[PDB]
Amino acid sequence: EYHGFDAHTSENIQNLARTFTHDSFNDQLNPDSENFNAKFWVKNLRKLFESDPEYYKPSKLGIGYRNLRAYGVPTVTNALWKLATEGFRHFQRYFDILKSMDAIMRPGELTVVLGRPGAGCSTLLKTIAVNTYGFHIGKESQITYDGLSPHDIERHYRGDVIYSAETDVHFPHLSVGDTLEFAARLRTPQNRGEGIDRETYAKHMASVYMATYGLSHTRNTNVGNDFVRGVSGGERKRVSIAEASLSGANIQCWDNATRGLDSATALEFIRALKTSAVILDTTPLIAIYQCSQDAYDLFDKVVVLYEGYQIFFGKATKAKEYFEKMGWKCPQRQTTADFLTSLTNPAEREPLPGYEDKVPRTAQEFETYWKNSPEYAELTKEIDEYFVECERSPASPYTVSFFMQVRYGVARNFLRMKGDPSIPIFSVFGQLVMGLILSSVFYNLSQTTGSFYYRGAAMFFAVLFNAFSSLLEIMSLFEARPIVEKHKKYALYRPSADALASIISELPVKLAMSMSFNFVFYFMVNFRRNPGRFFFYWLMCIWCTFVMSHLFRSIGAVSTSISGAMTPATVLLLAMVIYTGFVIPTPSMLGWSRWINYINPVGYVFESLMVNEFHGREFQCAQYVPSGPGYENISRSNQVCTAVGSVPGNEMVSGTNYLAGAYQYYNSHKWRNLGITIGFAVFFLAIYIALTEFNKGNREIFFWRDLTYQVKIKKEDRVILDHVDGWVKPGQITALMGASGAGKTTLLNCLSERVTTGIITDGERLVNGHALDSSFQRSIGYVQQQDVHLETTTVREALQFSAYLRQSNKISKKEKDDYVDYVIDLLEMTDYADALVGVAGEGLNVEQRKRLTIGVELVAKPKLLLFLDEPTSGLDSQTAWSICKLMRKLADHGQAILCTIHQPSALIMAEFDRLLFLQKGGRTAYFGELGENCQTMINYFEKYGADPCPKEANPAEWMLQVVGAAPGSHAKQDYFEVWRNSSEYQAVREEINRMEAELSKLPRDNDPEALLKYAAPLWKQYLLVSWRTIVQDWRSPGYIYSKIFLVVSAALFNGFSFFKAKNNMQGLQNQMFSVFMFFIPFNTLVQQMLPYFVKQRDVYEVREAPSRTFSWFAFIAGQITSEIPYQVAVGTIAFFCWYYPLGLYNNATPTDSVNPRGVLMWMLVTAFYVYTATMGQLCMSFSELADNAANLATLLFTMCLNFCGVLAGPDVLPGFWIFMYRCNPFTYLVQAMLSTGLANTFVKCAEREYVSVKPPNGESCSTYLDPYIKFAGGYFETRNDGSCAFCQMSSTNTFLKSVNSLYSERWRNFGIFIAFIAINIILTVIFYWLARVP
Ligand SMILES: CCCCC/C=C/C/C=C/C/C=C/C/C=C/CCCC(=O)OC[C@H](COP(=O)(O)O[C@H]1[C@H](O)[C@H](O)[C@H](OP(=O)(O)O)[C@@H](OP(=O)(O)O)[C@@H]1O)OC(=O)CCCCCCCCCCCCCCCCC
Ligand SMILES: CC[C@H]1O[C@]2(CC[C@@H]1C)C[C@@H]1C[C@@H](C/C=C(\C)C[C@@H](C)/C=C/C=C3\CO[C@@H]4/C(=N\O)C(C)=C[C@@H](C(=O)O1)[C@]34O)O2
């Protein structure tokens, strides 16, 4: 709790000053002397120890204006159309949002803007803080900032005026001390100063400001977010205030900073603002709606708006009186702020007796009265004097140079990495493990020509493993964007400085990754062993990773989520991967494709690495074309190697010749490519910095008796509820009230059987005098506090779903629909019945969402109770009053309601019928009728001895004060003892006994349908959930279109890079790697898909799981079935976009089997596109976060791809890894695909693959080579030289057999893949049961 600038804070500041004066070395300012006052010390410290520069930085600002006037101006099947319309709107009236006003705010005054939502307070505070982005300002207006101008403030005085409204953006894993010290050190001036180190001064600044705002205790504690634990809810707002004050802000504007915050938290926040205004001369503006009287007693000035009209402005204490002079009536026990706010509501409010004709009803009449009043005349006189006085009388807003900003950014980034080493450790160790595994695949490559291909493959993947190694770093960019924006607004540092700091801070991680991967890969794979070759390889890999890191940062500087950046960048990254130079060697490159390789930053890296390895090297020949049983005694001059650069009669193959023939790489480009890659890195770094700088912007009565409830905590059991008894009757509302530690929520959850812990010892809950049965949990509705709804379901659809799945199965659909309509009418939801729920920003209000939740829990027809968990909490005064009226209407119709109420207003409290009050230890203190204006309750606490309640006061707070639960109060008597020793308790016990003895004889109603766990059969639940998920996926905003575009673009690029392809010895390998690259969109698809699984899982587990709507099996089966249709359609599109451009059907013409092979390939592609979804869901079933599931799925996919039989077959793989070659799901898909697409067709060798053979003297190639052609496949062509050209392949079956793919085993492989899909589904279900189902 915060008490302001109390004596304790003064003593703490005294101790801090005493500590600091020793390092540093009027009667005040002496820590060791008497009568020293902390306020004067803090005030003078800023002006004295900060020195005086030659600029005109002001220490206080006040704002005055005279005539301020401000004016202004789905289903995917239609989305594209809408976009087109939007485009037309981009191809090519005048209403005042804020009418004329007059105001003046001076330093040291806390000002509050009041008004109902939509009045225009947010726009006024945006205008004051110079944030007019979305509306214009009238030319007649005149705004003066203590003599400056709005343009002057915006241009080179920013940071003096700040505007933060609702959500605080802090680094969750940075401690409060570090968070404040960062700003303190970034704001201190480096221009000399005093004989004190700057770091010491920043530390003293941070300590003093922590002490001032009561945060000294919360040092070295993570600030945290709504997810990460830390400073709970109110110390974070004070941290934000302290940080804003440290940055020199002099006019701080807040809009509903205390939104969804209880009265105590808002009161302490406003207290912190008041001390900020008092100690440090400041002009804070606050826009609040639910403000307590104690909080309102702190405000210095109030301005009240009526639809942006500013009916009144002036001293807060004189506000009510003025309006009471107007002719309005203020009901007693009503806070002044609520009275002022409701005076603008025609439905509420009422005039004084005899004033029914003099008060105004229109905002225009309100302005007329305001202007005619003498208060407006005095205000105008003051404004004129202020403007006359102001008229009579820094290059950049930042304080430290660019180098200092980037240095501090680097330090903060290191602190963040220390506070969360997850991503760096994961990246480093993933690189290490992947390098180890991949090297195990390529272990100890031979020195003969037979290793050529493998060597190339290695130097390809190494490049890839350096290109994408730094993909995860961009995640940090998505976490620091809001904070960087805020600090730019605060005028602390530029986004460019933060970008450079982020680049510099990740160098250690990049070095660790590069070392851990390369030092193992380059050496366990038998590459060139010379030191110079290794060092050149390492240098090129370093530059490749820098280039790709800068490219990834550039892509992620204009994106908000990993999937959002991944979807459009997937095509680009796949294009760079394909055109590296290995999948499609330059000789095989098509006409339209070469320009892609010319501008590829990775092609040059690959060329340099291959040139470095192969140039100036001789490889021993492995195979000679003429060989076998008939050529066991043939001369070496009549033979020739089978490589590309082979020369007849030579026993060795030159690396230079092979490189110049197969890949067309030359040694002249070894060092030039390094310069090209350096240029690419610099270019991408410049683009990234520019982007991050510029591109930014009933009949049964339920009663409990002797309910005792205890829970074991750390081997110790403490009773949370001690002998709590009561009842709930139809037609009455009972309010469950208590302190924070009174455990009223525990009582509510124990009564409703929604608490999974503890044991009830002496309790007894009964209905109509009978013990509880198995039908209880289905006869009580539970309206949770938080509203968890699907964003893609209309109100009517949600109500219909609940009614269908929760009402009796013997009731026809017509009755269910009619009851849904009746509930919609009763809750006054008919105006927006067919409106998407959407998100909080766009969609339904908080009131509408709460009404929808009550309706959802009402259409189930609960016949016993409606437990409401804090309905009037986190809501405005008027919205809370409306919801209370709705609850009263429900209770009128014949309902029984029990609700827990937290910090209510007097008017709200007067609406309830009965009250159950609990004090520490769950001890009942009162249980009885509230009476009129809570009078009866008061009598109970007044006739037993206590301080009489004031005539004007809130009885809700009076109760807490009386029982000692309020902060700063004395009980003076244990009220449990008097309650147990009262006549009221005896009456309650007698009533409970009478009810138990009487109602137990009533004839109960028996029906087995009510005893079932679920009201609908399993198949119906499965169907309904599957349909809901399908509709949600369809209606998501750009989810199906993103998938379609990604898959279509990737498939088209992969199928047209390999346009109709010659079946030469190299073309077959190119097509095999085309099949291999066809699987790359797996990661992007999983990343896109997982969040929409998270949404449904959250909605189910938070609300639908305990409500017993549908079982876990129905949920998981629906999730599994929802993705099959979309995946099948996308797979069909992908197959049509890839199979035909590749021209594979030509291979089927010779054997006449065109249709079967095309059909089988379509099945295989669709099966892969279903398997990707099944595997993503399997990896997501047991995991908690979407990022972890996506990363695990990517790891498993990479492992499956490594041992899929393309990089190295079973005969090359180590015996240890064969277990992964057989259990792979892709080792069969790839075999089936290759077999279907390539089998049973001829092969024609390219001009560069023909191998020259010189027959022995006196022989022709026919006679000399037919025995070999018979022994092994191939063909030969005569030449006009005496030699002849031999091609080692005559049919594609030879290549397929080499890859270990057979034509007769395609259907078996398809069946095995289907079996793997089934295993994935089964494991998904089982793991979801094991991990998530309680
Ligand atoms: C913030 C970013 C941080 C990034 C990190 C910063 C890194 C900055 C480093 C700067 C250092 C730059 C050094 C470059 C100067 C090279 C001067 C000689 C160039 C040369 O000498 O290169 C041809 C010969 C052999 O190459 P080669 O196979 O082609 O054989 C040739 C023959 O030797 C002969 O000399 C004829 O050459 P020329 O006719 O003159 O062209 C021809 O003869 P033939 O082949 O025709 O028979 C052939 O080219 O290189 C060889 O020995 C081995 C290959 C170079 C060996 C140096 C490797 C240096 C690694 C740098 C450090 C890496 C660590 C990375 C980070 C560390 C910690 C984080
Ligand atoms: C989660 C595991 C590790 O994952 C990354 C970053 C670091 C982690 C520890 C990143 C992966 C590649 C991976 C290391 C390299 C390989 C496994 C080699 C190769 C088989 C993988 C290529 C992957 C891709 C090619 O390019 C695709 C793409 N668009 O085409 C996008 C948007 C992302 C790529 C990707 O996400 O690659 C991609 O899926 O290192």
Ramachandran bin of 173, using left for φ above 0, alpha for ψ from -120 to 50, beta for the remaining angles: alpha
CA distances from 1233 to 993, 1145, 1175, 1310 (A): 78, 13, 20, 9
Question: Is 740 one of the annotated binding-site residues?
Answer: yes
| AA letter at 1127 | Q
Residue for token digits 């500087």?
557
Residue bearing the CA closest to ligand 1, atom 47: 616
Rounded CA-CA distance 446/525 in Å is: 9
Name the phi and psi angles at 869, rounded to 5.
Answer: -95, 95
Which ligand 1 atom sits closest to the C-alpha of 511?
69
Contact 914, 928 (CB under 8 A): yes
Closest Cα to atom 11 of ligand 1 = 539
The 8 Å CB, 24+ separation contacts for 989-998 are 989/725, 991/727, 992/703, 992/705, 992/725, 992/727, 995/701, 995/703, 995/727, 995/769, 996/703, 996/705, 996/766, 996/769, 997/769, 998/769
Domains of the chain, start order: 1-49+161-249 (no CATH), 62-73+98-150+290-393 (3.40.50), 402-615+670-693 (no CATH), 728-779+864-1004 (3.40.50.300), 788-861 (no CATH), 1019-1241+1306-1332 (no CATH), 1251-1292 (no CATH)
**Is 474 close to ligand 2, i.e. is its CB under 6 Å away?**
no
Q: Tell me which residue has tokens 């509420």.
A: 348
Residues sharing a CB contact under 8 Å with residue 84, sequence separation 6 or more, in sequence order: none
Closest Cα to residue 485, out of 475, 494, 476?
494
Report which protein residue has its CA nearest ligand 2's atom 20: 1198
Distance CA 626, CA 1264 (A): 9
Q: Ligand 2: which atom is nearest the Cα of residue 574?
A: 30
Ligand whose nearest atom lies closest to the CA of 615: 1
Indicate the burial class of 920 (C-beta count within 10 angstroms; 0-12, 13-18, 19 or more): middle
Q: Which DSSP letter does residue 346 get?
A: S
Q: How was this structure determined?
A: cryo-EM
Residue 333: both structure tokens together: 């026990």
Annotated binding-site residue? 726: no
Burial 989-1019 (b: 16+ CB within 10 A, else e): eeebeebbeebeeeeeeeeeebeeebbbeee
H-state helical runs in 526-671: 531-556, 562-578, 594-598, 601-614, 655-658
Task: Confirm or reject: Cβ of 647 under 6 Å from ligand 2.
Answer: no
Which residue, 48, 37, 32, 53, is CA-closest to 5? 37
Dist. CA 1183–CA 1327, nearest whole Å: 10
698, 631, 526, 356: which is closest to 1266 by C-alpha? 631
> H/E/C letters for each residue in 666-724?
CHHHCCHHHHHHHHHHHHHHHHHHHHHHCCCCCCCCEEEEEEEEEEEECCEEEEEEEEE
- The answer, yes or no, to whether any atom of ligand 2 lies below 6 A from the CB of 1191, is yes
744 labelled binding-site residue: yes
Does ligand 2 lie within 6 Å of residue 471's CB atom? yes
Q: Is 840 helix (H, G, I), strand (E, B) or coil?
A: coil
For CA atoms 349, 352, 353, 357, give the dihedral sign: negative
Query: How far apart are the CA of 532 and the centre of ligand 1, in A?
Result: 7
> What resolution in angstroms, rounded to 1 decimal?
3.1
- Judge contact between 226 and 54, C-beta under 8 A: no
Q: How far apart are CA 976 and CA 947, in angstroms?
A: 18
CA atoms within 13 A on the CB side of 713: 5
Cβ-count burial 360-388 (b if 16+ within 10 Å, e if not): beebeebbebbeebebbeebeeebeebbe
Eight-state DSSP code of residue 448: B
Name 625's Cβ contacts closer than 8 Å, sequence gap at least 6.
Answer: 639, 640, 641, 642, 1251, 1253, 1268, 1286, 1288
Residue in 1198, 1200, 1207, 1224 to alter for ligand 2 test, most ligand atoms within 8 A of Cβ: 1198
Q: Which residues, including other chains, have CB under 8 Å from residue 825's CB and lie 6 or more apart?
A: none
By DSSP bridging, strand 618-620 and strand 161-163 are unpaired
Spatial contact of 214 and 9, defined as CB atoms under 8 Å apart: yes
Cα(431)–Cα(411) distance, rounded to whole angstroms?
A: 25
Are the C-beta atoms of residues 1034 and 75 closer than 8 Å to each other?
yes
**CA 19 / ligand 2 centre spacing (Å):** 54
Asked if residue 1118 belongs to a known ligand binding site, the reply is no
Nearest CA to ligand 1 atom 9: 539
- Which are the residues after which the chain is interrupted (C to N > 2.5 Å)? 25, 73, 92, 393, 697
Distance CA 1044, CA 1041 (A): 5
Which letter does DSSP use for residue 1103 in this model? I
Q: Are 213 and 282 in contact (CB under 8 A)?
A: no
Sign of CA dihedral 1117, 1121, 1122, 1123: positive
* Proximal ligand: closest to the CA of 509: 1
Buried b (16+ CB within 10 A) or exposed e, 809-835: eeeeeeebeebbeebbeebebeebeee
Return phi, psi of residue 1103, to 5°.
-120, -50
Distance from C-alpha of 907 to C-alpha of 894, rounded to nearest angstrom: 23
Ligand 2 atom with least separation from CA of 1194: 1
Residue 942 to residues 167, 790, 935: CA-CA distances in angstroms? 44, 49, 10
Which of 260, 202, 298, 204 minimizes the C-alpha distance to 4?
Answer: 298
CA 147, 151, 155, 158 dihedral sign is positive
Contact 903/932 with Cβ under 8 angstroms? no
Nearest alpha carbon, ligand 1 atom 54: 532
- 821: its two tokens: 């309509």
3-state class of 281 per DSSP? coil
Asked if residue 881 lies in contact with residue 802, where contact means CB atoms within 8 angstroms, the answer is: no
60 is in an annotated binding site: no
795 touches ligand 2 (CB under 6 Å): no
Rounded distance between C-alpha atoms, residue 521 and residue 457, angstroms: 13
As a whole number of angstroms, the distance between CA 430 and CA 425 comes to 8
Q: Which residues, at least 6 apart from 82, have a Cβ–Cβ distance to it below 8 Å?
A: 74
| DSSP assignment string, 199-211 | HHHHHHHHHHHHH
Give me the helix-helix angle, 1018-1035 and 1082-1099, nearest 10°: 120
Gyration radius of the chain's alpha carbons = 39
For residue 1012, how far is the Cα from the chain centroid?
Answer: 39
Cα-based torsion angle of the residue sequence 1179, 1180, 1182, 1188 in order, rounded to the nearest 10 degrees: 90
User: CA–CA separation, 1128 vs 1125, rounded Å?
Assistant: 5
The reply to whether 165 sits in an annotated binding site is no
Contact 156, 163 (CB under 8 A): no
SS3 sequence of 1250-1267: CEEECCCCCCCHHHHHHH
Q: What is the dihedral of CA 679, 681, 684, 685, to 10 degrees?
A: -110
Is 462 marked as a binding-site residue?
no
Residue owning the nearest CA to atom 44 of ligand 1: 616
Helix (H) or strand (E) holding 618: strand 618-620
Residue 1185 is which amino acid?
L
> How many residues comprise the chain?
1334
User: Distance (Å, rounded) from C-alpha 609 to C-alpha 96?
Assistant: 67
Residue type for 947, please? D
Pocket (CB within 6 angstroms of ligand 1): 511, 532-533, 535-536, 538-539, 542, 615-616, 667, 670
- What is the identity of the amino acid at 1082? F
* Cβ(551) – ligand 2 distance below 6 Å: no
Ligand 2 site, residue 472, Cβ cutoff 6 A? yes
The Cα-based distances of 848 to 527, 618, 831, 868, 1050 in angstroms read: 68, 79, 11, 16, 43
CA of 455 to the centre of ligand 1 (A): 21
Long-range contacts of 1186-1192 (CB under 8 A, 24+ apart): 1186/1090, 1186/1091, 1186/1093, 1186/1094, 1187/475, 1187/562, 1189/1086, 1189/1090, 1190/562, 1190/1083, 1190/1086, 1190/1087, 1190/1090, 1191/426
φ/ψ (deg, to 5) at 233? -140, -25
Q: Could you say which DSSP state residue 950 is in?
A: P
3-state secondary structure of 1082: helix
Tokens of 879: 């919205």
Look up residue 631 and give its two tokens. Answer: 């050529």
965 annotated as belonging to a binding site for a ligand: no
Q: Which two tokens stand for residue 394?
A: 């820094």
Closest to 189 in 3D by CA, of 52, 365, 357: 52
The DSSP result for 764-823, as a single string, is: EEEETTEE--TTGGGSEEEE-SS----TT-BHHHHHHHHHHHHS-TTS-HHHHHHHHHHH
Long-range contacts of 1116-1119 (CB under 8 A, 24+ apart): 1116/1181, 1116/1324, 1116/1325, 1116/1328, 1116/1329, 1117/1022, 1117/1025, 1117/1026, 1117/1325, 1118/1022, 1118/1025, 1118/1026, 1118/1028, 1118/1029, 1119/1029, 1119/1093, 1119/1177
